[PDB]
Design a protein around this ligand. Structure first.
Ligand SMILES: [Mg+2]
Ligand SMILES: [Mg+2]
Ligand SMILES: [Mg+2]
Ligand SMILES: [Mg+2]
Ligand SMILES: [Zn+2]
Lengths: 129, 78, 64, 206, 102, 150
RNA sequence: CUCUAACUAUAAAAAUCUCUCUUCUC
């Protein structure tokens, strides 16, 4: 084999402040919670594709530091109450992972899907912007 | 008017034996020569900067490259 | 930190931006020409021109 | 060398051996080498031109502009407003003495120095105002090579003018000083200063 | 008068329908007057499909596809240009706009 | 003569909080001087400036007076500052004016001394202010203790 | 009288108005 030290990407992407969070395959001991929100300035870009790329580069450096070589992608959208759709920058995130040395495998979308339960904060007529 | 710049004399206009000493000394050592450049070291008002420039080309002190009106350029005689 | 890169543009991909003063094109790195990136640039160009870029990781979107 | 008989004789120096084109009869385009790859083919030094004045139809087409010799562009930039537009001879003389100064300082046949200043001073990155009203903010963008050389020229001339403005150090001197500082990487040049400032602000609104 | 034969509802003999909620404006909306879509798409943007493929173990991959049934209100949908205002003689054509790409 | 930055070194550190007086605006914002750290110039982009809507630019810029400042990025190789007026809160403003007064008083006393002696004020900070700021953490508190303790 | 596939993302504020109203026949 290639003796790859498998990790998990566990991408957390939303309409605001996408997250990057690598850990063990189970998800026991977390590595580098640092998100894209830890690297951008004006709050324009908490969920920017560039914020995702910066977070991905930092966590790739961290993974090389620790020894993780293969990583498993678990992207996420909030689901439940909010839009069921991935954060905009998360795609760049994964791409920034791919270009940055680390091997990848077993991409998954753990974006929750509910059975039409509870309610979405909003009111009857909906968001009245 | 309010001259907030506060420009001092910024140069002297009447030449002297000692600034003559400097002119004769650092006529070389300045591989670029032009009226503004020679003025810029406190030593000449500028009206007689041309006069000193004429004084320079007397005994093979500095060689010319350009001597145009409003703008003349020398380099130290090698 | 200057991993400077150079990319020859192959095609003009119209023009973006609300002003219409910035045009997006498809530029391929001279190093390993097999890959390309879509990038938006301010100022007239044509294919055959080469552009120096600091960054080599931006696929900028349709600017509005 | 190559002595030629005439009845209406022309000076010997311009009659010597000069199938060896020099701009001001003394500055060849030979061995003036193009540095930047993204800026090659956007500098016209290729054609050996005889003086920094040519009444060419150099604005009719979209991209015939790149066929204009770099010296001509620098001169035309040197023309300032209505007053310097109507006075091309003055600008040509000023740029001639500018190359003279460049030749005086650290030799380095001046044309290479000026083209190196050109390539150094060009901001490859810029900020575009994209946000509509509410989030009125600039965003990152890169810069066309023609746009590169254009702002390089513009920063050079604006620095020369601002430094020269109501200042004893004459415009030819200011321009040559800026060109020397820009052929190197010293922030003393106003042109390179603005180049780095735009690079920084672009690096902010990335 | 009457804007539409179906009153823009498409209930026509159901008495009532359990409401759904818009993805964007998030309004209670009758499930039939609830213009909605299958935003089918591959998990990755079409641009990087190359790079990721050689950035991964397990060659000859499948590249999964993420799905979503998005419920759009009337207002948000007409706002985001995903539904186009039409002439009445043009409105009635219920046929989908003929397979966007081919 | 005012020189010899109140704190230790020339270049501000990372995420250090300072105070800037507006000096000149071209289009991008307040590329101005600092009055707490070194007087080195630093950019202030307009989006890094306003919490409210940008209605009155001229009423807001207020040239000739100090204002809060947070440093985000520093040029430590040629000399420039990325500085902002958006990453501040009121309780942060409190310590901002505290530090403003703390630096102003020491600058006043040592400027008086350097003016009276004609001794280069950088030598004053070298010989006096910096050892006191090393012993006691700040030269102002050291002067206060000097009043009681010789 | 033989075809069933691709795809994206703005919503910043705008408040108001007292006028004259006029006529068609071989
Ligand atoms: Mg509304
Ligand atoms: Mg109606
Ligand atoms: Mg309907
Ligand atoms: Mg109204
Ligand atoms: Zn809606």
């Amino acid at each position: 084999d290639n003796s790859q030290v498998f990790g998990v990407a566990r991408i957390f992407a939303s309409f605001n402040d996408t997250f990057v969070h690598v850990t063990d395959l189970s998800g026991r001991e977390t590595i580098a919670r640092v998100t894209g929100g830890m690297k951008v300035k004006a709050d324009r870009d908490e969920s920017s594709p560039y914020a995702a790329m910066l977070a991905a580069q930092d966590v790739a450096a961290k993974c090389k530091e620790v020894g993780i070589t293969a990583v498993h992608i678990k992207i996420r959208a909030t689901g439940g109450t909010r839009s069921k759709t991935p954060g905009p920058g998360g795609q760049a995130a994964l791409r920034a992972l791919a270009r940055s040395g680390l091997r990848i495998g077993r991409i998954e979308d753990v974006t929750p899907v509910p059975s039409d339960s509870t309610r979405k904060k909003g009111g009857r007529r909906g968001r009245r912007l | 008017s309010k001259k907030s710049h506060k420009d001092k004399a910024k140069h002297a206009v009447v030449l002297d034996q000692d600034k003559f000493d400097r002119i004769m000394k650092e006529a070389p050592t300045y591989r670029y020569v032009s009226v503004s450049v020679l003025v810029d070291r406190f030593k000449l008002g500028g009206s007689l900067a041309r006069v000193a420039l004429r004084h320079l080309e007397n005994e093979g002190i500095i060689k010319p490259v350009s001597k145009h009106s409003k703008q003349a350029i020398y380099t130290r005689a090698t | 930190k200057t991993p400077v890169t150079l990319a020859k543009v192959i095609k003009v991909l119209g023009r973006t931006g609300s002003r219409g003063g910035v045009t997006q094109v498809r530029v391929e790195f001279l190093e390993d020409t097999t890959r390309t990136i879509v990038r938006n640039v301010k100022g007239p160009v044509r294919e055959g021109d080469i552009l120096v870029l600091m960054e080599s990781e931006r696929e900028a979107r349709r600017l509005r | 060398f190559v002595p030629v008989e005439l009845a209406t004789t022309i000076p010997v120096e311009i009659q010597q051996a000069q199938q060896e084109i020099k701009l001001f009869n003394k500055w060849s385009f030979e061995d003036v080498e193009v540095k930047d790859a993204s800026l090659v083919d956007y500098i016209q030094i290729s054609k050996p031109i005889y003086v920094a004045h040519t009444a060419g139809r150099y604005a009719n087409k979209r991209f015939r502009k790149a066929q204009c010799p770099i010296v001509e562009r620098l001169t035309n930039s040197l023309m300032m407003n209505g007053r310097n537009n109507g006075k091309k001879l003055k600008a040509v003389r000023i740029v001639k003495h500018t190359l003279e100064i460049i030749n005086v300082l650290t030799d380095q046949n001046p044309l290479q120095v000026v083209v190196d200043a050109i390539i150094n001073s060009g901001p490859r990155e810029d900020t575009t105002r994209v946000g509509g009203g509410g989030a009125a903010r600039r965003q990152a963008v890169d810069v066309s090579p023609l746009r590169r050389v254009n702002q390089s020229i513009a920063l050079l001339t604006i620095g020369a003018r601002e430094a020269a403005f109501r200042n004893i150090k004459t415009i030819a001197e200011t321009l040559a000083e800026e060109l020397i500082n820009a052929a190197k990487g010293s922030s003393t040049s106003y042109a390179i200063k603005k180049k780095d400032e735009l690079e920084r602000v672009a690096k902010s609104n990335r | 008068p009457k804007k539409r034969a179906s009153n823009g509802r498409n209930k026509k003999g159901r008495g009532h329908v359990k409401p759904v909620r818009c993805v964007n404006c998030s309004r209670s909306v009758p499930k039939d007057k609830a213009i909605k879509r299958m935003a089918i798409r591959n998990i990755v943007e079409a641009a990087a499909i190359r790079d990721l493929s050689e950035a991964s173990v397990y060659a000859e991959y499948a590249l999964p596809k993420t799905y979503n049934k998005l419920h759009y209100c009337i207002s948000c949908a007409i706002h985001a240009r995903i539904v186009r205002v039409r002439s009445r003689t043009d409105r009635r054509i219920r046929a989908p706009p003929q397979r966007p790409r081919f | 003569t005012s020189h010899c930055r109140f704190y230790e070194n020339k270049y501000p550190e990372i995420d250090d909080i300072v105070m800037v007086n507006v000096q000149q605006i071209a289009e991008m914002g307040a590329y101005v001087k600092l009055l707490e750290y070194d007087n080195i110039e630093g950019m202030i982009l307009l989006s890094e400036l306003s919490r409210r809507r940008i209605r009155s630019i001229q009423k807001l810029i207020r040239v000739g007076k100090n204002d809060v400042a947070v440093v985000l990025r520093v040029d430590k190789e040629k000399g420039y500052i990325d500085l902002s007026k958006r990453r501040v809160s009121s309780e942060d403003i409190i310590k901002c004016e505290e530090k403003y007064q703390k630096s102003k008083t020491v600058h006043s006393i040592l400027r008086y001394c350097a003016e009276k002696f004609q001794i280069p004020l950088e030598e004053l900070y070298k010989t006096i202010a910096w050892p006191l700021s090393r012993k006691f953490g700040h030269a102002y508190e050291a002067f206060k203790l000097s009043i009681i303790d010789e």
